[PDB]
């Protein structure tokens, strides 16, 4: 379950040792009409870099990419696609950018190949600057 690291993994704000005689979870809404998910409230994970249950603000840009690799832990790689217009030829090129985004463990079942909305935040690592804000499934793939 939880507490698999060296230090105690706890949400900083809520104080869990008030005397009695279950644990209250900290969550928020990130805004922009993004509805905070159900697993972020009934969840038992803690996360420093979760957009809903952590100390990150979603601010600036709102992008959307396509999940290609989910091998990094608590973060994944999305693949953005776009058509670039050269002006000599009146045509397009298919280019792409691979950015690494932080995938909170509230979005539980995510497979490769589904369009994911990400949101700009503070720089979370060397190459991570975006959190996953909502997930929609692929074409079909409801099985």
């Amino acid at each position: 379950d939880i507490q698999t690291e060296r230090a105690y993994q706890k949400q900083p704000t809520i104080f869990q040792n008030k005397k009695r005689v279950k644990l209250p979870r900290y969550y928020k809404n990130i805004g922009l009409g993004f509805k905070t998910p159900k697993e972020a409230i009934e969840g038992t994970y803690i996360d420093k870099k979760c957009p809903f249950t952590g100390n990150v603000s979603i601010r600036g840009r709102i992008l959307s990419g396509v999940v290609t690799k989910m091998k990094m832990q608590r973060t994944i790689v999305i693949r953005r696609d776009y058509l670039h217009y050269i002006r000599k030829y009146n045509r397009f090129e298919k280019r792409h950018k691979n950015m690494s985004v932080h995938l909170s463990p509230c979005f539980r079942d995510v497979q490769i190949g589904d369009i994911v909305t990400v949101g700009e935040c503070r720089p979370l690592s060397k190459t991570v600057r975006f959190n996953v804000l909502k997930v929609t499934k692929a074409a079909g793939t409801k099985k």
Partner: protein, 262 residues
């Protein structure tokens, strides 16, 4: 640049100062102050290039340090002081009071007013702060952080300030139907009623403004300065009264004026 820059080239100056291309390499760099670098008009530009009370910067220095000019009800003695929007620059020996508003174009105008109007001026509130003992603070566009304001005055409104006490008298809430000056952008100097407010979460919000003669236009909030309740301002408006008639209408109104004058 290993620190703060202190000059400004004549070419890189903001254009609404209307400084000539040829007479200088440098433009006067505005000192830091209650207005931004490109939003203000320097007092040397206000005296020398436009009123022509002075001829050169030495005469500007002599005017400014005989303790004559009194901007916003206080005498400033530096040549390059930033005098920005809605500022009251007063000259006591000529008995002549000037209020700084953009005209129909983007530039500032020599705008003579009365002393009864020069006793006050108007300010857009930028932010409301709460201070160190639960003390409401209101911050204007010219950094006038008067505290304990009226708790109905909120973020994007305007207030009327009596300058001698330096204190609020009345206010205009940012609401539809009120007149507004467009203090920035491509609509710089227009006057019209606020007809629509378009919200955008995250990005900047815009406002549709319908002028005196029907021509509506959109402008984001940061460039908008409300100037009075309803269809009437609380200040005296300049010549043109904020329309931006087209270039054809400007052409035939100067042509008919020269034809009628002869």
């Amino acid at each position: 640049a290993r620190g703060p820059k202190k000059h400004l080239k004549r070419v890189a100056a903001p254009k609404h100062w209307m400084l000539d291309k040829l007479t200088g390499v440098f433009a006067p760099r505005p000192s830091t102050g209650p207005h931004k670098l490109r939003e203000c008009l320097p007092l040397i530009i206000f005296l020398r290039n436009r009123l022509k009370y002075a001829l050169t910067g030495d005469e500007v220095k002599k005017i400014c340090m005989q303790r004559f000019i009194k901007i916003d009800g206080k005498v400033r003695t530096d040549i390059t002081y930033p005098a920005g929007f809605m500022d009251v620059i007063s000259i006591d020996k000529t008995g002549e009071n000037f209020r700084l508003i953009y005209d129909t174009k983007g530039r500032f105008a020599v705008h003579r007013i009365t002393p009864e109007e020069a006793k006050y001026k108007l300010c857009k509130v930028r932010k409301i702060f709460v201070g160190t003992k639960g003390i409401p603070h209101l911050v204007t566009h010219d950094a006038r952080t008067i505290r304990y304001p009226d708790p109905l005055i909120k973020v994007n409104d305007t207030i009327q300030i009596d300058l001698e006490t330096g204190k609020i008298t009345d206010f205009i809430k940012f609401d539809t139907g009120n007149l507004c000056m467009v203090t920035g952008g491509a609509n710089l100097g227009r006057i019209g009623v606020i007809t629509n407010r378009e919200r955008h979460p995250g990005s900047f919000d815009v406002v549709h403004v319908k002028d005196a003669n029907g021509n509506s236009f959109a402008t984001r909030l940061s460039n908008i300065f409300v100037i009075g309740k309803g269809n009437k301002p609380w200040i005296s408006l300049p010549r043109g009264k904020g329309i931006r008639l087209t270039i054809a209408e400007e052409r035939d109104k100067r042509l008919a004026a020269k034809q009628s004058s002869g």
